[PDB]
Design a protein around this nucleic acid. Structure first.
Length: 546
DNA sequence: CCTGACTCC
DNA sequence: GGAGTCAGG
């Protein structure tokens, strides 16, 4: 463990080379408006650590950061890019992201620091972040020399690992997936996250006031029906009320006790009316805790904006996730919760929200992959590896009739049946399944002798190519869309992606254009054997974009 | 801290 | 099938 570097006091010309590994260290998990604690640069000329107060106020270093012809290899470049946006600095020229490279090679490793990526190539001259910063309340930036060494070691690791990772991606036919899709998408997501979405806090607070009143009412009604006060938000206490006091049938247990899941409670409605009230209560309580209170807590008060983080290197299928706040699970199915969307508004006066969604993209993808004539034919003119049991439990119908449904289904769509058979056999033979744009998921459990383990892996084999291909497509569509927006000099920009949906805001005068541009681009992102279809709506709030 | 509840795709 | 957050414990 011997590695020389310069702890620099000022920026020098040799630090500004046209190819470098760059570390812009942000220690907080949520990098919005978070401190940059240190910088490291490794390039042909040497290894350098820079204090951010120095480097970020240096016009030549800022210039270098923003120069796209000066190429940087990084790890989680979006964290750096956004943290620098909050410092009013533009980051360009990112040509390699070790995080996204590691993610494509194997999503299951859950790589989230340089040390874990390095482990994939047996590179061990770098420590884990957790080792250096510590955890929980003990989390702290160490003394400068210890910090400096770590940052330089991380940059040095990125320097040496770039070619080995690129080499393996290319052997996997995933190099273009990294360079032409994930990496450009990363810059787009950074834009969306920094832009944020404006919230109508006056409206959200008034909703919370009315909701608190309504919860109280429902709560007292439940106690009345139960004959006793108890904590409705405790499945344990609730279980005692339902299955001991009221002596309702026990339909399901889990490892900790009686199940009070929504499915179960719905099936108990013919026994006691309290179960319908309880389901209602738990819905309203989630609205209050999460979409009123939890959302207000993360609103930046001066701008009334919320800034999510789209985790690009987390899910096993290639989807994004959204955290702090999650803006990909805002209520829509019940009118009571859907009204939450009235609180999401345009960031400027006389702008509107525009929302466009793919219709049944996973079913069109299945049609394409399976080349099922009947299914493809229908699309030119169901989501349930569900079993007869799950289907019956889902539809609250006869398990015998459920079995007949699934049977009839594969009779009618023999291409889909063939596909399900073939993809499982392929997974067993190769050890992984792949998506349309060459995303991979490894399934080492697929030949387990244990029924449950094997079966879960077989269902992943069936679903991942479908769900992950749909992810591939919308990602490409975002890249295509952004470009067309910039070409036409539109002010419209993306705010959110919700898996098979894109949400934008824009001057009212641009709706007409977007109504043609967004759907076309999204539909023409890839050519399948069936058409892609997109629906679109716009309005004064997200609610009204329906 | 995990579990089980609600939320979305 | 894929996700995140919350209260309770």
């Amino acid at each position: 463990a011997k590695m020389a570097f310069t702890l620099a006091d000022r920026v020098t010309e040799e630090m500004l080379a046209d190819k470098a590994a760059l570390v812009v260290e942000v220690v907080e998990e949520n990098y919005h408006d978070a401190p940059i604690v240190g910088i490291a640069v490794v390039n042909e000329h040497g290894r350098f650590f820079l204090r951010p107060e120095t480097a970020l106020a240096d016009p030549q270093f800022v210039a270098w950061l923003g120069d796209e012809t000066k190429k940087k290899s990084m790890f989680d470049s979006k964290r750096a890019a956004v943290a620098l946006k909050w410092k009013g600095i533009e980051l360009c020229g990112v040509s390699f992201d070790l995080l996204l490279a590691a993610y494509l090679l194997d999503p299951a490793q859950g790589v989230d620091d340089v040390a874990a990526a390095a482990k994939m190539k047996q590179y061990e001259a770098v420590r884990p972040d957790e080792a250096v910063y510590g955890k929980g309340a003990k989390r702290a930036v160490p003394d400068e020399p210890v910090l400096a060494e770590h940052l330089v070691r991380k940059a040095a690791a990125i320097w040496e690992l770039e070619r080995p990772f690129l080499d393996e991606l290319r052997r996997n036919e995933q190099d273009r997936l990294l360079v032409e899709l994930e990496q450009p998408l990363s810059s787009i997501l950074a834009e969306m996250e920094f832009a944020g979405v404006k919230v109508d806090t006056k409206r959200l607070e008034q909703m919370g006031k009315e909701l608190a009143e309504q919860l109280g009412t429902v709560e007292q009604r439940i106690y009345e029906l139960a004959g006793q006060e108890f904590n409705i938000n405790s499945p344990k206490q609730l279980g005692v009320i339902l299955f001991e006091k009221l002596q309702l049938p026990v339909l399901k247990k889990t490892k900790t006790g009686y199940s009070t899941s929504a499915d179960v409670l719905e099936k108990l409605a013919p026994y006691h009316e309290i179960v319908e009230n309880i389901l209602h209560y738990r819905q309203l309580g989630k609205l209050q805790s999460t979409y009123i209170e939890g959302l207000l807590k993360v609103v930046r008060p001066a701008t009334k904006k919320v800034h999510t983080i789209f985790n690009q290197a987390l899910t096993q299928t290639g989807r994004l996730s959204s955290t702090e706040p999650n803006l990909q699970n805002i209520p829509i199915r019940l009118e009571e919760g859907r009204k939450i969307r009235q609180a999401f508004v345009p960031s400027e006066s006389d702008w509107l929200i525009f929302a466009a969604d793919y219709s049944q993209i996973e079913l069109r993808v299945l049609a394409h992959i399976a080349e099922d004539d009947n299914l493809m034919e229908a699309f030119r003119r169901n989501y349930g590896g569900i079993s007869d049991y799950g289907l019956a439990q889902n539809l609250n119908i006869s398990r015998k009739e459920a079995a007949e449904f699934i049977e009839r289904y594969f009779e009618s769509f023999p291409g889909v049946k063939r596909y399900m058979e073939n993809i499982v056999q392929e997974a067993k033979q190769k050890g992984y399944v792949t998506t349309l744009l060459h995303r991979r998921r490894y399934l080492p459990d697929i030949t387990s002798r244990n029924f449950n383990v094997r079966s879960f892996a077989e269902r992943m084999a069936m679903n991942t190519p479908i769900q992950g291909s749909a992810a591939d497509i919308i990602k490409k569509a975002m890249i295509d869309l952004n470009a067309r927006l910039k070409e036409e000099r539109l002010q419209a920009h993306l705010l959110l992606q919700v898996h098979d949906e894109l949400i934008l805001e824009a001057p009212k005068e641009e709706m007409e254009r977007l109504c043609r541009l967004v759907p076309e681009v999204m539909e023409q992102a890839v050519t399948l054997r069936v058409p892609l279809k997109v629906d679109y709506h716009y309005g004064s709030t997200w609610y009204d974009a329906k």
